[PDB]
Amino acid sequence: AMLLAPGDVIKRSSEELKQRQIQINLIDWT
Amino acid sequence: AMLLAPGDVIKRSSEELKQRQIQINLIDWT
Amino acid sequence: IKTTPYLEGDVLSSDSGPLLSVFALQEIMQKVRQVQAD
Amino acid sequence: SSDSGPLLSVFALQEIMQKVRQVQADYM
Amino acid sequence: YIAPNPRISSITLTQRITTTGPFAILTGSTPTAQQLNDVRKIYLALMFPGQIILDLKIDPGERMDPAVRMVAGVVGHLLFTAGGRFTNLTQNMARQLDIALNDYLLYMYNTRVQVNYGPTGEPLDFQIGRNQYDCNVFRADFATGTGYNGWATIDVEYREPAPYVHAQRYIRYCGIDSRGIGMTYHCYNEMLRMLVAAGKDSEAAYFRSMLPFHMVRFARINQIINEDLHSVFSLPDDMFNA
Amino acid sequence: LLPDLIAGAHQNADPVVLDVSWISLWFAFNRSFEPTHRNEMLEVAPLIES
Amino acid sequence: WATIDVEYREPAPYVHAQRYIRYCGIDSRELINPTTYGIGMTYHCYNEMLRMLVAAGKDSEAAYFRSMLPFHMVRFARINQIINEDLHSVFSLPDDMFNALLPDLIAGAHQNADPVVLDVSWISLWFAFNRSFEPTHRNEMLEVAPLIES
Amino acid sequence: YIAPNPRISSITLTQRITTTGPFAILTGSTPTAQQLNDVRKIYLALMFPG
Amino acid sequence: VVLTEEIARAIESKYGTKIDVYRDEVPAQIIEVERSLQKELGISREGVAEQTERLRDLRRKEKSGITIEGVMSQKKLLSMIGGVERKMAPIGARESAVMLVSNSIKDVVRATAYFTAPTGDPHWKEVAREASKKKNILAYTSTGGDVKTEFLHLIDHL
Amino acid sequence: VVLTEEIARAIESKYGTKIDVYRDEVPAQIIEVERSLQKELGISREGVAEQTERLRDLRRKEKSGITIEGVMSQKKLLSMIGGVERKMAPIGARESAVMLVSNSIKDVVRATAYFTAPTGDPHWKEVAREASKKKNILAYTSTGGDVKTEFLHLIDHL
Numbered sequence A, B: 001a002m003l004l005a006p007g008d009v010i011k012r013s014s015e016e017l018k019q020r021q022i023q024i025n026l027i028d029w030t
Numbered sequence C: 001i002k003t004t005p006y007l008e009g010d011v012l013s014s015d016s017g018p019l020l021s022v023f024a025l026q027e028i029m030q031k032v033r034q035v036q037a038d
Numbered sequence D: 001s002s003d004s005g006p007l008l009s010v011f012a013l014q015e016i017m018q019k020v021r022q023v024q025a026d027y028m
Numbered sequence E: 001y002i003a004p005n006p007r008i009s010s011i012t013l014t015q016r017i018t019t020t021g022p023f024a025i026l027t028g029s030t031p032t033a034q035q036l037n038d039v040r041k042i043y044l045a046l047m048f049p050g051q052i053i054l055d056l057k058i059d060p061g062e063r064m065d066p067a068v069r070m071v072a073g074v075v076g077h078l079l080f081t082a083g084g085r086f087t088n089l090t091q092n093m094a095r096q097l098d099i100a101l102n103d104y105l106l107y108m109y110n111t112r113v114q115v116n117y118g119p120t121g122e123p124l125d126f127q128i129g130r131n132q133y134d135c136n137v138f139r140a141d142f143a144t145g146t147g148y149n150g151w152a153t154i155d156v157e158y159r160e161p162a163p164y165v166h167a168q169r170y171i172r173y174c175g176i177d178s179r180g181i182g183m184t185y186h187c188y189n190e191m192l193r194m195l196v197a198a199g200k201d202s203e204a205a206y207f208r209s210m211l212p213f214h215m216v217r218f219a220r221i222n223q224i225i226n227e228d229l230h231s232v233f234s235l236p237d238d239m240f241n242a
Numbered sequence F: 001l002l003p004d005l006i007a008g009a010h011q012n013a014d015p016v017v018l019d020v021s022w023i024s025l026w027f028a029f030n031r032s033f034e035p036t037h038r039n040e041m042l043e044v045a046p047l048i049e050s
Numbered sequence G: 001w002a003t004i005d006v007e008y009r010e011p012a013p014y015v016h017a018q019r020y021i022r023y024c025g026i027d028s029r030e031l032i033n034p035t036t037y038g039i040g041m042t043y044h045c046y047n048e049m050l051r052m053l054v055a056a057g058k059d060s061e062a063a064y065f066r067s068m069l070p071f072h073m074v075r076f077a078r079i080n081q082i083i084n085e086d087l088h089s090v091f092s093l094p095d096d097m098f099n100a101l102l103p104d105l106i107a108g109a110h111q112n113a114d115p116v117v118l119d120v121s122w123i124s125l126w127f128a129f130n131r132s133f134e135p136t137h138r139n140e141m142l143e144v145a146p147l148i149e150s
Numbered sequence H: 001y002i003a004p005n006p007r008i009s010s011i012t013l014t015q016r017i018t019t020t021g022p023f024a025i026l027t028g029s030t031p032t033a034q035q036l037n038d039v040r041k042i043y044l045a046l047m048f049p050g
Numbered sequence I, J: 001v002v003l004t005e006e007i008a009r010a011i012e013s014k015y016g017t018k019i020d021v022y023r024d025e026v027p028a029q030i031i032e033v034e035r036s037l038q039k040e041l042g043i044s045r046e047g048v049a050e051q052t053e054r055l056r057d058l059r060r061k062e063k064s065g066i067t068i069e070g071v072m073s074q075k076k077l078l079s080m081i082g083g084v085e086r087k088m089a090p091i092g093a094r095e096s097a098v099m100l101v102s103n104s105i106k107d108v109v110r111a112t113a114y115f116t117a118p119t120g121d122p123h124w125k126e127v128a129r130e131a132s133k134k135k136n137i138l139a140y141t142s143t144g145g146d147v148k149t150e151f152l153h154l155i156d157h158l
Helices: A007-012 A014-019 B007-012 B014-019 C020-036 D005-024 E022-026 E033-047 E066-079 E091-106 E186-198 E201-228 E237-241 F002-007 F023-030 F045-049 G044-056 G060-084 G095-107 G122-130 G145-149 H006-017 H033-047 I005-014 I035-041 I045-064 I074-081 I124-132 I147-157 J005-014 J035-041 J045-063 J074-081 J124-132 J147-157
Strands: A002-004 A023-025 B002-004 C006-008 C011-013 E115-117 E126-128 I029-033 I067-071 I100-102 I113-116 I138-141 J029-033 J067-071 J100-102 J113-116 J138-141
Touching (some): A007 A014, A014 A023, B007 B014, B007 J147, C006 E033, C020 E033, E066 E091, E186 E201, G060 H006, G060 H033, I005 I035, I029 I035, I029 I045, I035 J045, J005 J045, J067 J074
Parallel strands (some): A002 I100, B002 J100, B002 J113, I029 I067, J029 J067
Antiparallel strands (some): C006 C011, E115 E126
């Protein structure tokens, strides 16, 4: 399964996701 | 079972009664 | 009495929407249109 | 302390009714 | 459309998703307009048993976690009725629900138990549990309806001559009447027997607690058919039986 | 009663459960009941149920 | 070692391939989840491997293997699942030739269609055990195939 | 193609003091395309054992 | 640090105390094992021999001109280490059943679930709409408060 | 005092001698046990390490500048403690089959026995008459001399 989450919470919790070794695709809106 | 005893001997042996953990009701007659 | 909330795209809402009879009419009519639709 | 039949019956019935009211908390 | 317990959707998600599992993953989800429309479609199908039949919306573009189909197969057995004197499902839909429940009963993620399969590859053709208890009954059969709410329970009866002389029947769901607290029925009791034999005590307690909501909802639906819908346009009794 | 509990689905009058705490078990062991005297209504009951 | 890998369950739809395959004694029907499976059970040959190594007194490799086990189990579990589910096709090699493969090799002279050999390096085996395949989603041309072979 | 959890990977840091172990040859290198082709066709043989 | 990896592995197998091995760095404190605790831990005679050669090398070092003390009991060793392990700890195949979480719009065709919360994203309205357009989708929502804990708990459970 | 609770509980098992354990209070006298009495009693090999490490801690304390002496034989230890126990001492459910002994006037309806003796109570005549009016009662009397020992004997035996 795949999940869609907002970019702000991805940016805030990206350390946990990279600690868990999950794949992330992101677009930063500047 | 229960027992009735005179107040003077209860007052004299109340230390043994509390050492043996018995219940007492007493009326001091002044 | 209000219905329990159901999410609308990104924000929760609790609207009852169209009446059940109207919904049944439209569903049956659309289904029979699909049946004839060729 | 001490205990007795009538008071204990009232007791246990009170908690049974409390539990049944907790059951009917789902009963709208 | 009302939840069994109001306002439970707005409490925090960590409270609602208590543990891990298919049912735990499924709980915490919220529906949208598509599922609302499909739910009212289901309810209309329940309100009209003799004219509305249901089947799945299957497309090649589907992709989702198997747990949702799994739970649907688990719960459609209690929700729908088949066999007896009236049916609400197609053979294909009953077959799909049955194979989904087969998948659930073979799904094991906490504890590994013994399994004893049968001669064929049919769904539910096996014996489970420390005591050998047969799950092959819930395989769909329209002759009696073993796997649904028509299993060994009366559903239609007659009380007094109706004002409309072609609609004498009274249609009662789960054998109860409006004119009930804590009462159960055969299909639900045997579903709980299956679940306690499977040792899935989480959803055993879940369904055991969820009984009254099911019973009151089905009583309300029963009332709607037996009271409001009595008109000249109701289906004749012989055609309903045939 | 016991086969019904191990079967998991009751057909007749079910038993009743109640809630207790952790320290209640140690207190239950360290206290003990002792009957003082028999019930006042013990002797006359058969008339009531008859 | 000390296990059976061939079973004839039922009259399967493809009558020319009515056979079932299971590696390491893992049944295909019991679908699993990678987060909770592969821990707490071991199979036969691995059991003799670990007992032999701990008898020999080597311990770093023993700890490494007993820790790495769930990766092995999830890999061959998915392998059993995909070899029993997805690859079932009319082009699958039939039961007669499958039975005759091993006696043909032990006889040393082929008379019908022989197998094919490929060459690999030493480090490839370690990389093979350190990696594992994982199916994302089923093939696009999967369901329509019977029309093509018909 | 998925990689295992790296909690086991501390064994190569233990190998610094325990240098005598021939296991894993202190692997810290990315394999080459021919090695990937080799392991791919190994796993193809695993797919088709016969 | 301790004199030998043999003692290190013995105490690791008995509890899991990760005590380092001496490699001639600094004038630090050195802990060694004598007959009673050797008999307790059950080392082969080779390791006890090795510890003996190491101790005699240290005595030679101190005569040629670093502090060494030995522990007598298991209770004293436990109090000296200051740590007891919790056992258990199995490592699984992967951390979560969800391999990927994203925010792009191209992957809405392949996406399977989405969680919503008030966010400052220019395309959140869009992507939420085209994700909700699916007939069978797994949607979750926030209920205020700390949404990070909710998201982490949800992504652990899923 | 002795250096450990282990030895105290061991000699509690052997005879039942309640002996305290030193906790750094005063420069007191300390007993210690060597190989002979250790082999006699059969303490586990773990406790020898604790006792010897306590002895070498006292050695360090002495070198830092309290009295310690050892017992060699069982007979010497028996003379050392100066007491031998009486083995088993079972305890019943309660001290006496009589739970309550009172004097109040309202309890004569529920009372079941009474002892009499010449007493200076204003209501002794009344309570004695009321207790004697019952159809089946247990009455005891004094015969002069010591009343306290008789009453104590009666209350233990009844």
